[PDB]
Amino acid sequence: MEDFVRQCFNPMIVELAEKAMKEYGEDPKIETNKFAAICTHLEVCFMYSDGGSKHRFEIIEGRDRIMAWTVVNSICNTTGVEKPKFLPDLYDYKENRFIEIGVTRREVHIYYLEKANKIKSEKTHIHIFSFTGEEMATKADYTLDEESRARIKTRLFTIRQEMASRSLWDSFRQSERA
Ligand SMILES: O=C(NCCc1ccccc1)c1nc([C@@H]2CCCN2C(=O)c2c(Cl)cccc2Cl)[nH]c(=O)c1O
Ligand SMILES: [Mg+2]
Ligand SMILES: [Mn+2]
Ligand code: NA
């Protein structure tokens, strides 16, 4: 599965995932399922931000902590929206709201509730994807057009199928916790 991650994801995504794991004392070569999950969430965040028009989204995920908060605090001062307690994943300039992106190996409704209870940021918009084409967004408001969403869901399904063809999926599928 370490080989799978390194050939499947772009090298900057892989480097970011490695850093994120090591910042919590985890070895990407050992906790390989976690390695893959972080890479997938990152790739989805980047795909999401490419989904609209140029300049529609600001990417917050994937930045070091100081720059990420400089972006958040800047947006809050420029648009007046409330400052979140946790770093979200994107800001949407069209809808003027932060977005929290979730990618789950379990079911989208359970993950949605968990995310909602965890952030408790009434104003942050939540959008969840699964590896089997399901999604769940706040107020059933999905932000992107169906073509963009289809691209994301299609990529997640491809990853899922690739893992399965290597007998890695069932270990990966059961590795997520609440
Ligand atoms: O922004 C995120 N993380 C900010 C930093 C952070 C770090 C720890 C706890 C809270 C926040 C973030 N994180 C996760 C999931 C659940 C929380 C951890 N995690 C990871 O992927 C993960 C990371 Cl980052 C590093 C090592 C191991 C893991 Cl398992 N899911 C998201 O959708 C998401 O946006
Ligand atoms: Mg995040
Ligand atoms: Mn997220
Ligand atoms: Na989070």
Author numbering: 1 to 178
Please, what does the article write about this entry?
The influenza virus RdRp is a heterotrimer that includes the polymerase catalytic subunit (PB1), the ‘cap-binding’ subunit (PB2), and the endonuclease-containing (PA) subunit. The ‘cap-binding’ and endonuclease functionalities of RdRp work in concert to perform the essential ‘cap snatching’ of host mRNAs to generate primers for viral transcription. The essential endonuclease domain within the PA subunit is a particularly attractive drug target. The chemical scaffold for our studies is 4,5-dihydroxypyrimidine-6-carboxamide (DHPC), which was originally developed by Summa and coworkers (Merck, Italy) into the first-in-class HIV two-metal integrase inhibitor raltegravir (Isentriss)30.
Initial diamide compounds such as 6e (general structure 6: R1 = phenoxyacetyl, R2 = 2-methoxy ethylamine) showed relatively weak activity in the FP assay (Ki = 1.6 μM), but compounds such as 6f (general structure 6: R1 = 2, 6-dichlorobenzoyl, R2 = 2-phenethylamine) showed improved binding (Ki = 0.36 μM) for the amide series, although the potency was generally not as high as the corresponding carboxylate analogs. The difluoro compound (7b) was observed to be significantly more potent than the initial dichloro compound (7a), so the crystal structures of these compounds in the PAN active site were obtained to investigate their modes of binding. Although the protein structures, including the two metal binding sites, are nearly identical, the R1 group of 7b adopts both cis (44%) and trans (56%) amide bond conformations; while 7a only adopts the trans pyrrolidine amide conformation. In the cis conformation of 7b the difluorophenyl group stacks against the metal-chelating heterocylic core, while in the trans conformations of 7a and 7b, the R1 aryl group extends into a pocket created by Tyr24, Glu26, and Lys34. Regardless of the cis or trans conformation, the R2 2-phenethyl stacks against Tyr24. For this type of inhibitor, with R1 = aryl and R2 = 2-phenethyl, we observed that the two bound conformations of 7a and 7b appear to be representative of the most common binding modes for the series.
